[model samples]
Target: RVLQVDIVPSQGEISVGESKFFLCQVAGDAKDKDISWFSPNGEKLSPNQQRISVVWNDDDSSTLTIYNANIDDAGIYKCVVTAEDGTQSEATVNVKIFQ
Candidate 1:
């Protein structure tokens, strides 16, 4: 089965230095799924994001947490999920930082 992906705070704007959190939820019947987060520049974020925290749920959902968000964190974020069945789902989040 194919995986389903969704993102929260889908449409909104924020200011620099402000913290924010995004939930990248994934669902499917497949096991051994892999969840990864990437930046607009295609840079893979450090595991747990250091300044940010991530949590994976038993139901196959993941949350991205940003603490004391800054301009550096501004950009598009993609959540790539690879299911055990070899199916994949992706969701993108746009983040804008204001001075």
Candidate 2:
């Protein structure tokens, strides 16, 4: 069986100084997994920064939020799902910030 991943706000756009978030959900026979989020620059979201944080939901989903978003925050972010058996799946979300 393969792990399935879905992301909300397929594409996000927000004004500078605003906030934006993406929700990543995993579904499959193997719910025992780890969810990781990466920045546009390939930085793991864990050990979150001052303006960025991650929240895990009860339904095998997690949210990555950017506070006080700026132009530097605009780009593609990656969500990776690692199953217990070493299986992995990945998805990407695009975020745009405007003046």
* lDDT (tens digit, per residue) of candidate 2 on 23-52: 898888675788888889878766356687
Candidate 2's C-alpha runs over 4 A off are: none
lDDT tens string, model 1, 1-99? 557888898854678667777888877767778887887678778655477677777577777777777777788888888877667778988877777
How well does candidate 2 score on lDDT at residue 36? Answer: 88
Candidate 2: deviation at residue 25, Å? Answer: 1.4
Off by over 4 Å in 1: none
User: RMSD of candidate 2 to the true fold?
Assistant: 1.5
Model 2 has a clash total of: 0
TM-score of each: 0.84, 0.89
